[PDB]
Symmetry: C3
Subunit: 28 residues, 3 copies
């Protein structure tokens, strides 16, 4: 279960990283 939790956490970090890229794009 811990492995599956580490899997969901890794996808959340990747999705947040993409959200930060769009915010940086909107700023420009």
């Amino acid at each position: 279960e811990i492995x599956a939790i580490k899997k969901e956490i890794e996808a959340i970090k990747k999705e947040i990283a993409e959200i930060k890229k769009e915010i940086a794009x909107i700023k420009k």
Copy 2:
């Protein structure tokens, strides 16, 4: 403990969904 962690991940997923909708609202 692990249940507590599960409730945090589900709450995090819902905020990320709301953040995407808020970004879409600002673009419009």
Copy 3:
């Protein structure tokens, strides 16, 4: 392992709160 998972979740929460504040600051 659990100590590291809580540390990542606590950091993700802090990142989401920063994103919500910064998104409100943006003017299209």
